[PDB]
Nucleic acid binder design. Structure first.
Ligand SMILES: Nc1ncnc2c1c(C#CCNC(=O)COCCO)cn2[C@H]1C[C@H](O)[C@@H](COP(=O)(O)OP(=O)(O)OP(=O)(O)O)O1
Ligand SMILES: [Mg+2]
Ligand SMILES: [Mg+2]
Ligand SMILES: [Mn+2]
Length: 757
DNA sequence: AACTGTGGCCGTGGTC
DNA sequence: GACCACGGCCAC
């Protein structure tokens, strides 16, 4: 299989490198013949002789057109012949493309900003990660000496650990009496030893947890101090550290640096993404954390080093175990997009969609539309109406079924052929007309994007059917994550239509999709209420909760299955209403906030404070105990006692202050905030002390006793000292606990006054 | 992480 | 007090 491709320049000419593993052997294939290009649409074929003469300059190098060939293409499905303009070197294209577009004989140009190595994979029909090849994998981690106030990597690496199918080991330069610890003379020899190990094992995949932003940058700084050529690459190169967005990413050439952190972060929803949290969520086993402060004290005092080495060994071990499960999931996605695992595992959803569409467009002889310029971008900044959200029938309900459309927005795109190459096309035999907004879509031929969603959706449902039949609960989660990733990808094609930077931008398409969605869900609600006697309790976009007032569970389930047969026979094309589940009881608070319990006793909660990273644990813990007392024990008096116990404890300063921490993300430069909430107030006091506040910084603060603005008396939890600081017990009662639980216990006749003291 | 999309709750600190 | 805009995170 193909692992990666890139290009190097040799005597001014590009050379593609294809990193392969075949029959257990690593190979590098070199292609010297592939040429960069873009397309020009000319006013007349005779003008090509002029265009061939246009020249540019880049760094004292004259740029010329190497050669041309005329080709038949389609633009949004309409045939058109264009000139493929070839060049000697990819950098020629940025240097000359404006001069060609400016030529009076040139109407427009296309596909002039495609990275060369990806262009090669598309045009050659090559797909990374295809085949039965078994890849060898190696995880690694590091332990460092840390002191507050120091620069990054001023202190040495203390241990380097690595794990694979054969076990886990730790390299260190102090004497630790553990069988898996290899003792070397110095930090320098420890790094050189790890390098030796990577070259001996020759792994196809290096697995880290956040190596993109910590491990490799730390190693590089230390290797710069120590004079080490850290040649982990299979071509003898050192790791290649590149900016990517607001952070960095690291390649190791000829292998795949698989950083688990970007994958996990976008696949699993956790409050924190410490390695220990991730391990426990995936495998159901605890992992102990040893903190930087303990590690430094152990190294300097020479005591309890065995515990640090064990912690370091366990980091590599669980990092290997995780990579073994998540690599095949991301390899599948890599095959579906047609790009390397390295790119796909780190890329925004927009880039995944666009790379997929560029390959498919090449397969179908379709020219890609261009990315918008600044002025077109400003023109694309109007919003449009979305899904319908019904105001819920508040309170406790029994014997609830949940019905929900299968992949609704993609199914609408498929069924009604919603696409910019079909929008208001004239002269067709058949049209579908979007409700409310009136846009017409021709049905005589499959639209570009509609024609591609079907395979995604059919793949997803195969995974879903296997998921629901999987005994192994770990394997079941992993299938869940796969089918969810395809779901979001498919839905992102709809969002792509309304994305201002999209090449296949079409706002008419996007608002037609949502308009159809609104008409389908309200029609479905009308039918189930009118013709089957249901009451719809709550509905959001494409699903709803409903019951038959006064009927038992068996009756509600039976009549819901009858309604599904009836409604699906009336729905056109790929539109299908699904049975998602039955809940013995449910409590609906507001739009987007409710909790249901199934017949096995499992509670599911949506939108409520329990699921929000930005509410205090004491409020979430209390709300969770209350929901359990209500939905599971049907015990209202108990839920009330729980609240009363909590408020009393808070009043008496008996709640641990850890449960009172509030977490809120900084999303922008501090200068750009118009409204200064508590987390920005704290952030501005830290910045004034020299702390590097950037977008993505989480502020973790606690509210101290006082009266005025909350931000005036919020401090970071780092600075909280229980001997000097009294937390604001009234704030956590009146601003956190009570609001969270009173919105629920109102339904049973309890005012806040009934829950205080 | 997200810049694939819109809808929505709710705390906060302002206005009057 | 009533009201509003901002900003975060969440449900689709
Ligand atoms: N990321 C998105 N980008 C653009 N549009 C999006 C989404 C998005 C989502 C999500 C992920 N959340 C979950 O998976 C569950 O997490 C809940 C935890 O609180 C929903 N929509 C739109 C299009 C979609 O057809 C419609 C109905 O939604 P929804 O029935 O769930 O999906 P669906 O009908 O396609 O798929 P299924 O029913 O699963 O078959 O809303
Ligand atoms: Mg839904
Ligand atoms: Mg908003
Ligand atoms: Mn759905």
């Amino acid at each position: 299989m193909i692992l990666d491709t890139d290009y190097i320049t040799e005597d001014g000419k590009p050379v593609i490198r294809i990193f392969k593993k075949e029959n257990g052997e690593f190979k590098i294939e070199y292609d010297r013949t592939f040429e960069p290009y873009f397309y020009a649409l000319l006013k007349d074929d005779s003008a090509i002789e002029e265009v061939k003469k246009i020249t540019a300059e880049r760094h004292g190098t004259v740029v010329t057109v190497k050669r041309v060939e005329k080709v038949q293409k389609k633009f949004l499905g309409r045939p058109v012949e264009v000139w493929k303009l070839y060049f000697t070197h990819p950098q020629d294209v940025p240097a000359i493309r404006d001069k060609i577009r400016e030529h009076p004989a040139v109407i427009d140009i296309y596909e002039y900003d495609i990275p060369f190595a990806k262009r090669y994979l598309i045009d050659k029909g090559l797909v990374p990660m295809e085949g039965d090849e078994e890849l060898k994998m190696l995880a690694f981690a590091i332990a460092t000496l840390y002191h507050e106030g120091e620069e990054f990597a001023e202190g040495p690496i203390l241990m380097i650990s690595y794990a694979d199918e054969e076990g886990a080991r730790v390299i260190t330069w102090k004497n630790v009496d553990l069988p898996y610890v290899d003792v070397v003379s110095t930090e320098r020899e420890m790094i050189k030893r790890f390098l030796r190990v990577v070259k001996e094992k020759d792994p196809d995949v290096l697995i880290t947890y956040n190596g993109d932003n910590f491990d490799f940058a730390y190693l590089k700084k230390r290797c710069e101090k120590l004079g080490i050529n850290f040649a982990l690459g299979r071509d003898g190169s050192e790791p290649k550290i590149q900016r990517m967005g607001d952070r960095f990413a690291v390649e190791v050439k000829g292998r795949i640096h698989f950083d688990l952190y970007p994958v996990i972060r976008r696949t699993i929803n956790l409050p924190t993404y410490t390695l220990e949290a991730v391990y426990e969520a995936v495998f159901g086993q605890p992992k102990e954390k040893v903190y930087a402060e303990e590690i430094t004290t152990a190294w300097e005092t020479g005591e309890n080093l065995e515990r640090v080495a064990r912690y370091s060994m366990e980091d590599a071990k669980v990092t290997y175990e995780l990579g073994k499960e998540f690599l095949p999931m991301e390899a599948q996605l890599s095959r579906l997009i047609g790009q390397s695992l390295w790119d796909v595992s780190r890329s925004s959803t927009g880039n995944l969609v666009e790379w997929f569409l560029l390959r498919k467009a090449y397969e179908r002889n379709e020219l890609a539309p261009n990315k918008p310029d600044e002025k077109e971008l400003a023109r694309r900044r109007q919003s449009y109406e979305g899904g319908y959200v019904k105001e819920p029938e508040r309170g406790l309900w029994e014997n609830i079924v949940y019905l929900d459309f299968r992949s609704l927005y993609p199914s609408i795109i498929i069924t009604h052929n919603v696409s910019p190459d079909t929008l208001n096309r004239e002269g067709c035999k058949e049209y579908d007309v979007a409700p409310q907004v009136g846009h017409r879509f021709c049905k005589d031929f499959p639209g570009f994007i509609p024609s591609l969603l079907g395979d995604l959706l059919e793949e997803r449902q195969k995974i879903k059917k296997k998921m629901k039949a999987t005994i192994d609960p770990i394997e079941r989660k992993l299938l869940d994550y796969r089918q969810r990733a395809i779901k979001i990808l498919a839905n992102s094609y709809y969002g792509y239509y309304g994305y201002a930077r999209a090449r296949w931008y079409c706002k008419e398409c996007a608002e037609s999709v949502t308009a159809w969605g609104r008409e389908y869900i309200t029609m479905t609600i009308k039918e189930i209420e009118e013709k089957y006697g249901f009451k719809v309790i709550y509905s959001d976009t494409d699903g709803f909760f409903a019951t038959i007032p006064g009927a038992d569970a068996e009756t509600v389930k039976k009549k819901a299955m009858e309604f599904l047969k009836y409604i699906n026979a009336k729905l056109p094309g790929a539109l299908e209403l699904e049975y998602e589940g039955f809940y013995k009881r449910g409590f609906f608070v507001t739009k987007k906030k409710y909790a249901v319990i199934d017949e096995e006793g499992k509670i599911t909660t949506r939108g409520l404070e329990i699921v929000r990273r930005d509410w205090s644990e004491i409020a979430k813990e209390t709300q969770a105990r209350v929901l359990e007392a209500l939905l599971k024990d049907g015990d209202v008096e108990k839920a009330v006692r729980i609240v009363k116990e909590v408020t009393e404890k808070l009043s008496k300063y008996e709640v641990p202050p850890e449960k009172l921490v509030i977490h809120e993300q900084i999303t922008r430069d501090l200068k750009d905030y118009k409204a200064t909430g508590p987390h920005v107030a704290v952030a501005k006091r830290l910045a004034a002390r020299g702390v590097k506040i950037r977008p993505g910084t989480v502020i973790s603060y606690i509210v101290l006793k006082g009266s005025g603005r909350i931000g005036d008396r919020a401090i970071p939890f780092d600075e909280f000292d229980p001997t000097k600081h009294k937390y604001d017990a009234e704030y956590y009662i009146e601003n956190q606990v009570l609001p969270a639980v009173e919105r629920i216990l109102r339904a049973f006749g309890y005012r806040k006054e009934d829950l205080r003291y």
